[PDB]
Design a protein around this ligand. Structure first.
Ligand SMILES: O=C(O)CNC(=O)C(=O)O
Ligand SMILES: [Mg+2]
Ligand code: NI
Ligand SMILES: [Zn+2]
Length: 331
């Protein structure tokens, strides 16, 4: 068995190996990358996502979200408070202000300590889930707006044509902006490219151990757990690495820098934070190996999780017994 300790693997494809996306994901899996739940891909030195980032200030963040925490430093939830619209230029200025800027620090490890110690006492503002792309249309390799669609994958594997579309999303982050513990919708893969700015630290639980994290979460968030059998789908709960270690939950951590891709694998729980002003792009995707995960994915039917139009067909076709109850939660 490849990668039996479920360590996060880092890949350095050549320009020739960067041509065929599907083939390279399958190569990474042949080496056991999926066992970690997360992999890093450093693009060949010849590659670029676009020529420059000098002209992105007029992008609009229609609904910036202030991330307000409740709980204790290591075990907290966050809610999102909607703020007034601002441009990327305005947001970048805010991120760099004395109220929100990254503090002085020695290294990534010192910054991680400061995050976990102090996150709950501040409410950073995140520009999330903005439909769009920063890849140049002429970038032919690993362009997140030109991937094969999950609808076409389900049709190729299962023979059924379905409605829906699959497009990327932009994330503009600042110091302490936070992504809560989750897997993807329908336990899909995700791919994330850090276009510019400061790093993003990730934590991940190997897929084979995801139920251990779920059990701890039910213990640590007991009201939430009573309200919904799949409440991590709400994307609001944070658990620190110190707490995970104290409770014997297997996990790994890695920092992604600008110009690097991360891939999350089916049923790989992940969480993390941004180091300072940055812009990432991400999208879900599928492979043939995903289908069995899609069939078994938990669902939130309490009404909180509320998801895209395109998840309907995945539930309908892969989870027909669940469909009626899940759709009630959507309505
Ligand atoms: O970058 C973020 O805020 C969160 N991204 C992801 O969870 C992802 O790419 O799967
Ligand atoms: Mg612009
Ligand atoms: Ni994710
Ligand atoms: Zn729910």
């Amino acid at each position: 068995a490849q990668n039996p300790n479920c360590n996060i693997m880092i890949f350095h494809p050549t320009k020739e190996e960067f041509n065929d996306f599907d083939k390279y994901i399958a190569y990474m899996e042949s080496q056991g990358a999926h066992r970690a739940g997360l992999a890093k891909i450093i693009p060949p030195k010849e590659w670029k996502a676009r020529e420059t980032y000098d002209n992105i200030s007029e992008i609009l963040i229609a609904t910036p979200l202030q991330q307000v925490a409740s709980g204790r430093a290591g075990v907290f939830t966050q809610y999102h408070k909607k703020k007034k619209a601002m441009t990327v230029g305005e947001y970048r200025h805010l991120a760099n202000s004395k109220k929100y800027q990254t503090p002085p620090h020695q290294n990534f490890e010192d910054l991680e300590r400061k995050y976990w110690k102090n996150r709950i006492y501040n409410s950073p503002i995140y520009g999330a889930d903005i439909s769009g792309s920063l890849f140049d249309e002429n970038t032919k390799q690993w362009n997140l707006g030109h991937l094969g669609t999950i609808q076409d994958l389900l049709e190729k594997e299962c023979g059924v044509v379905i409605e829906g579309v699959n497009t990327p999303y932009l994330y503009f982050g600042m110091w302490k902006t936070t992504f809560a513990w989750h897997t993807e919708d329908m336990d899909l893969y995700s791919i994330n490219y850090l276009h510019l700015g400061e790093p993003k630290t990730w934590y991940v639980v190997p897929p084979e151990h995801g139920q251990r994290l779920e059990r701890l979460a039910r213990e640590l968030f007991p009201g939430s757990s009573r309200g919904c059998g799949a409440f991590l789908r709400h994307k609001v709960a944070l658990i620190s690495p110190t707490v995970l270690k104290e409770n014997g939950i297997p996990f790994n951590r890695i920092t992604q820098e600008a110009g690097e891709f991360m891939v999350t694998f089916p049923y790989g729980y992940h969480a993390g934070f941004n180091h300072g002003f940055n812009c990432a792009e991400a999208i879900n995707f599928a492979t043939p190996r995903w289908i069995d995960y899609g069939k078994m994915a938990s669902q939130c039917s309490c009404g909180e999780a509320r998801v895209t139009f395109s998840m309907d067909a995945f539930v309908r076709i892969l989870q027909p017994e669940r469909y009626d109850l899940w759709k009630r939660g959507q309505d």
